[PDB]
Design a protein around this ligand. Structure first.
Ligand SMILES: [Mg+2]
Ligand SMILES: [Zn+2]
Ligand SMILES: [Zn+2]
Ligand SMILES: [Zn+2]
Lengths: 119, 64, 52, 134, 263, 45
């Protein structure tokens, strides 16, 4: 009866998927608010985003398990950017994903042969 | 009433795996252990065919 | 201070459960909304989970 | 926390603790008189008085609903009438508590003695687990 | 380099091992596969006559979970239909939703047993066709009947992800276990009388160390090597799921970049 | 007027308003009501 609409979990109600906004405090550091997409994309740009020596902070946390979104704070400090730090990250990811998407499509058919066939 | 279809915890389909189940614990002299021969390694859902009550044979006989 | 979630129960704050000597055994709790802007003031400046 | 539990939605989606809630509405046909009739006729907004927020648009020619018509709200399901231009038809028909919803399982129309008609309506309303259930 | 090292496969599950990668990505792959992976499933029934014992409400929920073929899906126009929500057509149309039929009657007097077989698609080799997990059977069970209890149902499937209802995920579960001994001590085992003595070594434990010493334990070490094991429902071939996992995971990272380099 | 159905036989009683509640080629005196047409909107959840 007061069950939020499920489809309002996978569809931005005219809500700007991403939003990039500096802070104050902190200086040279901004806070990103991706919406209707979280708990997956977020964890990556972290346990990986922190891998760039350029970084000095890596936010990430869902404010409430009812709202389907999440913030991300990055500080850096000192030259750029940090809209560029997370993109350099995202890019390093998509490309690191295929690294495995290919090995998969490569080793699959390769151990499909040993279980008979034929052709 | 009739098997749940799709176990409660996973997705493992169980609608298919009963017309065949019952034809062992009462028709092949194999144990409750026999379901293991149906790909039930997890707890899990396999307590699905096991903890089930056939409430339809005993409901179907009320003909209008 | 209300606001405002969905699903049909009253979410309230665990550290406030002791004063209401009552768990979540499916308990009910009543809500009384003020009207006039002169009481809204009383139960804000004197009676408040904080000042209590 | 403190005597409370959190349940997996995936499960409740496949049927954990899904239940049904049949409710049934009894209604006869009193007759005092003299000879005062009171049939289950469909109320006619031409000389009734009084009943609004219907809608009676869900009653058949029989003045009774047909399963399994999606009934919700304060919808009505039976219709009464009691004599007294354009006079006179009253309305002692029973509505449906808004707090309930869902379709209509089946209805059973028999005879009482008494000596008139006698209807029973049952509606089903699936109930899923929701935050706040015991 | 590598990255994956598969072991056994079957027709419903795919056991393998990740290599050069981080924890995050692992989990973030576990999740992906369990949720946002487009599939077909039925999400609307119209009943005409039903004098059986399962109520209409009870059939909808049941006719739903029964898996269907999906295969390609993300490849329109044909052999794949885009979400029925963002469709170029109005309301509901076969161009973005597959119609299904169920006209079950009774010609016997003993007892009927209607399976997933009796349904009827349309003939648009989508598909489409449900599945038949059962061995040379006819599919998952739907309902039973006695005398004259014919039911007539119109079913149409849409496209959806687990997120929207557990009904869609074509994925059973997943079975990972990074660091099977206890290198990084990411866990404090409860004794009760003797530690490495109460807890069972795992089948996947025979692929590593670091017993002996007293090195002492390391710490510059991050968790790599993850022993996953994906199992599908039977709705769509056993990966499939995995393959289509990253395809809509890369594209989820992209969304981001494009919303930051354009402006 | 409409049609009704008996608790046992089920044969079409097609009986008239204000009369007597019963059957025709049999006995007992109750009766339910045929399900409407009626293609009804049903979510699968
Ligand atoms: Mg107590
Ligand atoms: Zn299970
Ligand atoms: Zn369409
Ligand atoms: Zn009869």
């Amino acid at each position: 009866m007061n069950q939020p609409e499920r489809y309002e979990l996978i569809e931005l109600m005219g809500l700007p998927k991403v939003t990039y906004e500096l802070d104050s405090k902190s200086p040279n550091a901004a806070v990103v608010t991706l919406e209707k997409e979280d708990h997956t994309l977020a964890n990556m740009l972290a346990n990986q985003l922190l891998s760039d020596e350029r970084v000095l902070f890596a936010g990430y946390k869902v404010p409430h398990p009812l709202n389907h979104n999440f913030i991300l704070r990055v500080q850096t400090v000192e030259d750029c950017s940090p809209k560029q730090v997370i993109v350099d990250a995202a890019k390093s990811l998509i490309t690191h994903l295929e690294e495995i998407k290919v090995n998969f499509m490569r080793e699959w058919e390769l151990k499909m042969i040993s279980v008979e066939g034929v052709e | 009433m009739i098997i749940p279809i799709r176990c409660f915890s996973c997705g493992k389909v169980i609608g298919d795996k009963w017309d065949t189940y019952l034809t062992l614990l009462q028709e092949d002299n194999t144990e409750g252990e026999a379901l293991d021969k149906l790909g039930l390694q997890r707890y899990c859902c396999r307590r699905m065919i096991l903890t089930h009550v056939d409430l339809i044979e005993k409901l179907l006989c009320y003909n209008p | 201070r209300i606001r405002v979630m969905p699903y049909s129960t009253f979410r309230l704050n665990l550290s406030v459960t002791s004063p209401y000597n009552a768990d979540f055994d499916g308990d009910e709790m009543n809500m009384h909304v003020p009207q006039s802007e002169e009481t809204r003031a009383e139960i804000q400046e004197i009676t408040m989970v904080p000042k209590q | 926390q403190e005597d409370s539990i959190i349940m997996n939605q995936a499960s409740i989606d496949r049927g954990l603790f899904r239940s049904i809630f049949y409710r049934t509405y009894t209604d006869q046909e009193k007759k005092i008189g003299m000879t005062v009739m009171e049939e289950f006729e469909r109320p006619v907004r031409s000389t009734t008085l009084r009943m609004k927020h219907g809608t009676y648009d869900k009653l058949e020619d029989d003045g009774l609903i047909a399963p399994g018509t999606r009934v919700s709200g304060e919808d009505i399901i039976i219709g009464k009438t009691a004599p007294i231009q354009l006079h006179a038809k009253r309305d002692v028909s029973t509505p449906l508590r808004s707090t309930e919803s869902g379709i209509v399982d089946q209805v059973m129309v028999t005879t009482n003695q008494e000596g008139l008609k006698f209807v029973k309506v049952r509606m089903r309303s699936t109930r899923i687990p929701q935050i706040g259930d015991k | 380099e590598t990255h994956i090292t598969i072991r056994n496969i079957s027709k419903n599950s795919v056991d393998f091992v990740l290599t050069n990668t981080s924890l995050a990505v692992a989990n973030s792959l576990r999740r992906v596969v369990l949720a946002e992976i487009p599939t077909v499933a039925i999400d609307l029934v119209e009943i005409n006559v039903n004098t059986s014992v399962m109520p209409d409400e009870f059939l909808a929920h049941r006719l739903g979970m029964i898996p269907l073929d999906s295969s390609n899906i993300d490849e329109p126009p044909p052999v794949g239909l885009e979400y029925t929500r963002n469709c170029d057509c109005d309301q509901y149309c076969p161009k973005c939703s597959v119609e299904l039929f169920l006209n079950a009657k009774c010609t016997g007097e003993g007892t009927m047993e209607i399976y997933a077989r009796d349904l009827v698609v349309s003939s648009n080799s989508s598909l489409g066709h449900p599945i038949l997990a059962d061995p040379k059977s006819r599919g998952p069970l739907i309902c039973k009947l006695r005398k004259e209890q014919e039911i007539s149902l119109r079913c149409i499937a849409k496209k959806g992800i687990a997120k929207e209802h557990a009904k869609w995920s074509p994925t059973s579960a997943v079975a990972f276990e990074y660091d099977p001994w206890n290198k990084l001590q990411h866990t404090d085992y409860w004794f009760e009388n003797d530690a490495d003595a109460e807890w069972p070594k795992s089948k996947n434990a025979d692929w590593e160390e670091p017993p002996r010493e007293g090195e002492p334990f390391n710490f510059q070490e991050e968790p790599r090597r993850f022993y996953m094991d994906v199992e599908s429902v039977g709705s769509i071939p056993p990966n499939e799921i995995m393959v289509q996992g990253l395809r809509i995971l890369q594209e989820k990272l992209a969304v981001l970049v494009r919303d930051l380099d354009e402006e | 007027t409409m049609i009704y159905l008996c608790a046992d036989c089920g044969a079409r009683n097609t009986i008239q308003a204000k009369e007597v509640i019963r059957c025709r080629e049999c006995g007992h005196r109750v009766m339910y009501k045929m399900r409407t047409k009626r293609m009804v909107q049903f979510e699968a959840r």
